């Protein structure tokens, strides 16, 4: 059934086709029954040249266009399916030399199911030409230019199906200059109809048919598809300024019925924006304000092209980073922060947005440093983004209770998929040891239960996504609020005679900035419950994060939220590594020592009566306070000469009225 046993059986088409109205079930057994699946023992050479006569005699039946489906015109696409699956190393000329006089009939006309045979067969003739180098690509490039000059007639009657892809990706390169590139450019300035510019007045259908508008934006689109491949190794000249307004003019009116062309329309934009001299003038000719979600008004189709629509623009703003004045970059933070906080996009798009937000910041201190009359607006500029970081991992603290639901589902799914490894064949011990022992409530999960869920339910580690987000965003937040220190006032207003003790230590903030510091600390110290060296990295990042924080403006966060940290410590014990990192090594352990002892002196009045847990926590917390007076002690030991005698005597009287009176004397020996 791969030898001449076939040839003894498909004799029903030893003619071309008898009863030509019923060829589709009589002689269409070629690629649909026999050829598609057999073998390849070099047999195709023996009979494909013998069915080229059946090919051309079947090609006798394309006389007439205009809706003649059953004898002719779906048999046309059947012949498309005849051609489209052949490749060999012989006899290219008995196809190519006779195909085009059989394809000449269909190309200028477009109405009532034609305009496809020369093009879509020319995909197959094109790729069959790509395998070889017979040098007649310029010999039959002529009819393509004849199409591209037959276009204004066809848009004069019909107020296309060019499909410019598989003509000029030949890439042979002794090619011509002005006929090919003019065949590109002379479709640009063509109005789609004249009506749509009259539509264009109040965006910042009235044509009689709308299907032809689709057919012409598809051709002008495929124009914008091709000439990047005429650009990506290819330097261009004599015109560079016609492209930007053509790009946004092409994006602005594309129908919401389909955005599958918008995909690599947008790839065809990022190839332009990637290259060097086609970056700078697009601010000079579009000014970036036409790059909002006007490019996406088909939203049920433009909900799966939302990452690619913003990655090119964010990578473009990061790609220029030059001559960006302050108003457009504050525009970029006030849209990209919203793209961060918007939950529906992704995870990696959000981290890409945050990375974009940090990678601008050197132009914020450079730009605010060049003309310092508008310097504090660069500071508040620099803090809107940290507010957006705080809200971003403020949402995770709320999503906590169902994050552990899907994580418990994750290890109960992991332990039923990684348990199959344990019964492997490579074991080589058991038959030897046994030889020896022979010889001897759904809060948030609404979205995942809807009848149109549109994609599979997520099954990764939510914890590792959270830790990726914390290490990433905190890791940016260090050098952000570190680099806040270059915007400070001079000390002469502040009236301090310790000048070089500034410029790393003190800043000054308004109320609605230290609130966002406070809720940064609060909605980060809540965040540790997901997590333990991965926790310790965030302990170190928050600790190191608040060294640069103006300690008289640091003390007010920790006086008011140290009791919250305390009531968090009573459940998880690791957060002492927070407080340890605040007073075993700082500038300002002469502050956190005194604040910690003010808290513990207040909670020594009864607090040996209580259970083992908070007695263990407090008796560690004292010892971490007094281990900050033997490490440093050329520091304020005077932080401790008040309230240490009252600690002794009051630790005696509270021991005579306690319920477990030994913990006070153990506190005396650890003093």
């Amino acid at each position: 059934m791969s030898l001449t046993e076939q040839i003894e059986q498909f004799a029903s088409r030893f003619r071309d086709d008898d009863a030509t109205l019923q060829s589709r079930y009589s002689t269409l057994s070629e690629l649909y029954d026999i050829m598609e699946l057999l073998n390849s023992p070099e047999d195709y050479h023996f009979f494909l040249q013998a069915v080229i006569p059946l090919l051309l005699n079947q090609l006798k039946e394309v006389p007439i266009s205009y809706d003649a489906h059953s004898p002719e015109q779906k048999l046309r696409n059947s012949m498309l399916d005849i051609f489209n699956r052949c490749l060999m190393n012989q006899t290219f000329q008995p196809y190519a030399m006779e195909v085009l006089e059989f394809l000449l009939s269909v190309l200028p006309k477009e109405n009532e199911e034609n305009g496809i045979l020369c093009m879509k067969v020319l995909t197959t003739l094109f790729k069959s030409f790509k395998s070889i180098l017979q040098d007649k690509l310029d010999s039959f490039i002529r009819i393509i230019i004849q199409i591209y000059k037959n276009t204004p007639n066809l848009i004069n009657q019909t107020f296309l199906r060019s499909s410019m892809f598989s003509f000029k990706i030949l890439s042979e390169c002794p090619i011509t200059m002005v006929t090919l590139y003019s065949s590109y450019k002379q479709l640009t300035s063509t109005s789609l109809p004249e009506f749509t510019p009259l539509i264009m007045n109040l965006l910042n259908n009235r044509p009689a048919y709308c299907d032809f508008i689709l057919a012409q934006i598809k051709a002008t689109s495929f124009l914008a598809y091709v000439f990047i491949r005429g650009y990506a190794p290819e330097f261009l000249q004599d015109y560079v300024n016609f492209v930007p307004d053509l790009i946004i003019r092409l994006l602005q009116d594309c129908p919401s019925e389909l955005s599958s062309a918008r995909k690599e329309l947008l790839h065809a934009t990022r190839h332009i924006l990637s290259t060097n001299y086609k970056k700078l003038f697009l601010p000079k000719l579009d000014y970036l304000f036409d790059e909002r979600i006007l490019i996406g008004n088909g939203f049920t189709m433009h909900e799966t092209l939302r990452p690619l629509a913003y990655s090119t623009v964010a990578d473009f703003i990061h790609n220029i980073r030059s001559e960006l004045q302050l108003s457009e970059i504050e525009k970029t933070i006030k849209i990209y922060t919203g793209y961060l906080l918007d939950e529906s996009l992704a995870l990696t798009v959000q981290i890409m947005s945050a990375k974009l937000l940090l990678n601008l910041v050197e132009r914020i201190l450079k730009l605010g440093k060049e003309n310092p009359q508008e310097a504090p607006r660069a500071k508040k500029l620099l803090m809107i983004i940290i507010d957006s970081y705080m809200n971003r991992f403020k949402t995770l603290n709320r999503q906590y209770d169902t994050i552990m639901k899907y994580y418990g589902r994750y290890e109960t799914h992991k332990k039923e998929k990684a348990e199959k490894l344990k019964n492997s064949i490579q074991d080589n011990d058991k038959e030897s040891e046994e030889f020896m022992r022979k010889v001897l409530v759904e809060m948030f999960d609404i979205k995942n239960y809807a009848p149109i869920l549109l994609l599979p339910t997520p099954t990764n580690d939510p914890i590792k996504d959270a830790f990726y987000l914390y290490r990433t965003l905190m890791s940016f937040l260090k050098t952000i609020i570190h680099d806040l220190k270059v915007f400070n006032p001079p000390p002469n207003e502040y009236t301090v005679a310790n000048p070089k003790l500034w410029a790393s230590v003190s800043r000054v903030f308004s109320y609605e900035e230290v609130i966002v510091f406070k809720d940064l600390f609060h909605e980060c110290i809540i965040g540790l419950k997901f997590f333990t060296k991965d926790a310790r990295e965030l302990m170190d990042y928050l600790a190191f994060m608040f060294m640069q924080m103006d300690n008289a403006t640091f003390n007010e966060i920790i006086e008011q939220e140290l009791p919250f940290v305390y009531e968090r410590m009573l459940e998880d014990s690791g957060l002492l590594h927070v407080a340890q990192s605040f007073l075993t090594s700082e500038i300002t352990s002469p502050n956190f020592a005194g604040i910690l002892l003010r808290f513990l002196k207040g909670k020594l009045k009864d607090l040996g009566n209580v259970d083992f847990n908070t007695s263990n926590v407090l008796i560690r917390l004292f010892k971490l306070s007094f281990m900050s007076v033997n490490l440093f002690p050329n520091i304020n030991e005077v932080v401790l000469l008040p309230h240490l005698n009252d600690l002794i005597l009051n630790s005696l009287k509270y021991s005579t009225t306690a319920e477990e009176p030994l913990v006070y004397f153990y506190l005396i020996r650890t003093l």
Partner: protein, 431 residues
Amino acid sequence: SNIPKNQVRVVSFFTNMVDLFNTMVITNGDEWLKKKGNMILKLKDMLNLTLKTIKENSFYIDHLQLNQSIAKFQALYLRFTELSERDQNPLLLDFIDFSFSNGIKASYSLKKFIFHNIIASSNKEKQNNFINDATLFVLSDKCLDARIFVLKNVINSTLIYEVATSGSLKSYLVEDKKPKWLELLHNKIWKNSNAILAYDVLDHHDLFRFELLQLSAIFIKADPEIIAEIKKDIIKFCWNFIKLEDTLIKQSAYLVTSYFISKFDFPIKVVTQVFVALLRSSHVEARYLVKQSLDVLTPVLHERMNAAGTPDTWINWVKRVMVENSSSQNNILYQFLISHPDLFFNSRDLFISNIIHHMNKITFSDSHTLAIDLASLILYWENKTLSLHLREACTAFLIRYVCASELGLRAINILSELISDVKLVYFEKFS
């Protein structure tokens, strides 16, 4: 009185006002407007005044203190809304309020509320009139289609939370006495949103259609047995969206009619080409819709075929289109469409050898899973019952796959069953 005399302190004039009133919520724990609400709608009007005058003028936009005090006013106003017994009229003036800006549902100062009237506690008899005034509000044409997307959130969230935290619509329909939202679903179907299925005028969004796709979809899940002529109106409403031009509305309504016809009201003029153009090649945006639609569809098209279904011509569609695909991602789409159903194809031996050739063309990554899973399919088929060279292609492919290279261990088990149902020298060939 000092907003329109300067025009730039309006951020520092709204934030001070929600400062003062937010202070006076704290020192009067009951309420300091008798829990009646006259002091605070001046604040909502005030929010529209300062928000309008920042959208008008130039300099300061998206300050920190407006980003805070919107989320503060939101908290005290929305805190008032639960502190009254006319609980349904002030809920929606806020939805009229955020028409300009203010976050698409800045949550937990506005959405933590909206969860509290979702069906817990399980038989509270007040969310009925919430769904009633909600259904009158979504049909109000003269307000904010994006806030009708907000209305998807409230209405369809509380309905599918009812479906989730019950069997299927057990706690409603007290002998069908005053639902007063199913007859506004008769405003929905008996308007049809004619002519084009949403509003020829410039809408800027395509969401409301997908709302009625979901809200139409849930009742075929919920109550496919109670009032089935109403679900026939659900058919003739939902069958119309199939004639659209995108994909993931066409395959979404096509999904929900593919979900319907397993229940009742079976035609044959439609269903055949419904799953034929499910097994017709769609492109990669909503392949999972084709997965759940066809793989939940296909069992009832095996049982509602027979007693009139002696041919497997409906499976010959799968054979012929699997020939037509010009083997690519398109056939790979159909391989799990003969794998997610397994137990009832069992027709002929045409599926085997050509897909063994495909499955040889996989390994010339992320596609090996289908290749070994096909061997689990044939290993199911000779275990469902319990001409030689194709077995040499399968087994010899498995020898070449193990010798070539979690899933390979499963290939060892598949080989470990298949053989007791190449030999010597090929092992000589094997940083």
